[PDB]
Design a binder for this molecule. Structure first.
Ligand code: HEM
Length: 154
């Protein structure tokens, strides 16, 4: 898949807004993911004991990790499709060390789109959401292809 420059502009326009508060968006996203799909929490050995959203909101650790995730995703989106080098080390740790199925990447894709829709309605109308969805589908397709080369699958 290939996004047009107009689509990348809609994606980087709303991402510039997310970058005004990276830690808050990171938090929102991970909590949304853990509440919606609680099975995903079991993958994190560092955060699986968290019982409630209040506990999640108060974890400093969880918040730092949300900044780590979003910084890594933001550096990929800014490449505008030329992200091969960035994807390599991310695909190798998530397929070999963390063991994250593609289905979970779909779940966090959904969580991103939910949070952007709630925090940025004006910059996340239907065309912008379609371009963000296209950018994350591209990311999942490329990561699934790398998963295959690395030997992870199902
Ligand atoms: C937008 C998609 C994602 C991005 C960009 C992302 C990125 C990261 C980054 C940069 C790290 C630290 C470096 C490394 O271990 O590779 C990381 C660690 C990790 N990731 Fe992801 N990730 C994504 C989705 C997920 C999903 C969906 C799960 C599980 C449901 C997951 C589980 C983990 C685990 C278990 C760690 C280790 C956390 C800790 O250090 O203990 N990741 N991820």
């Amino acid at each position: 898949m290939v996004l047009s420059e107009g689509e990348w502009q809609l994606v980087l326009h709303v991402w510039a807004k997310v970058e005004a508060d990276v830690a808050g968006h990171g938090q929102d996203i991970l909590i949304r993911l853990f509440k919606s799909h609680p099975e995903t929490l079991e993958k994190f050995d560092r955060f699986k004991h968290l019982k409630t959203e209040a506990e999640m909101k108060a974890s400093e650790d969880l918040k730092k990790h949300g900044v780590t995730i979003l910084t890594a995703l933001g550096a990929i989106l800014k490449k505008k499709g030329h992200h091969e080098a960035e994807l390599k080390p991310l695909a190798q740790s998530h397929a070999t060390k963390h063991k994250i199925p593609i289905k979970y990447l779909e779940f966090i894709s959904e969580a991103i789109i939910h949070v952007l829709h709630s925090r940025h309605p004006g910059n996340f109308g239907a065309d912008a959401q379609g371009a963000m969805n296209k950018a994350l589908e591209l990311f999942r397709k490329d990561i699934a292809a790398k998963y295959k080369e690395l030997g992870y699958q199902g």
